[PDB]
Amino acid sequence: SIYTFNELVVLDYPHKDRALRYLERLRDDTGIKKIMDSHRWTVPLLSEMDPATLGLNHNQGAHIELRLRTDRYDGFRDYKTVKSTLIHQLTHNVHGEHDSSFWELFRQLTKEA
Ligand code: NI
């Protein structure tokens, strides 16, 4: 689809090859692809958030950041947690505040993904 992450950016820390594979896997994730296609979400930039809040959504999906690392050397967060954080950030494309409606949608997107 056009409803993907157009550009991936990782940071200059040890094992940056692994960081990039992390973002590529999230982008190629069947559940993530399905929900972005269904909801017509293009995210121009998916970037790694610096180590040392596990994600941010800037201006309704113009730029999403994900903290992949637990430290500055080789500690990475588990895919399961990062994936849920991405869905969290995507949920922010509709609901900015963590209110009743946010949790409904987040549960819905999680279900579909
Ligand atoms: Ni949030």
Author numbering: 2 to 53, 62 to 122
From the publication, what sentences describe this entry?
Covalent DNA-protein crosslinks (DPCs) are toxic DNA lesions that interfere with essential chromatin transactions, such as replication and transcription. In yeast, DPC proteolysis is catalyzed by the metalloprotease Wss1, which permits replication in the presence of DPCs and provides resistance toward DPC-inducing agents. Intriguingly, Wss1 is a DNA-dependent protease that degrades DNA-bound substrates in vitro irrespective of identity. Spartan (SPRTN, DVC1) is distantly related to yeast Wss1, displays a similar domain organization, and shares a common evolutionary origin (Stingele et al., 2015).
While most proteins were insoluble, we were able to purify the protease domain of Wss1b, one of the two SPRTN homologs in Schizosaccharomyces pombe. The overall architecture depicted a compact protease domain consisting of four tightly packed α helices and a four-stranded antiparallel β sheet. The glutamate residue E112 polarized a water molecule for the nucleophilic attack of the substrate; in agreement, its mutation to glutamine resulted in a catalytically inactive enzyme.
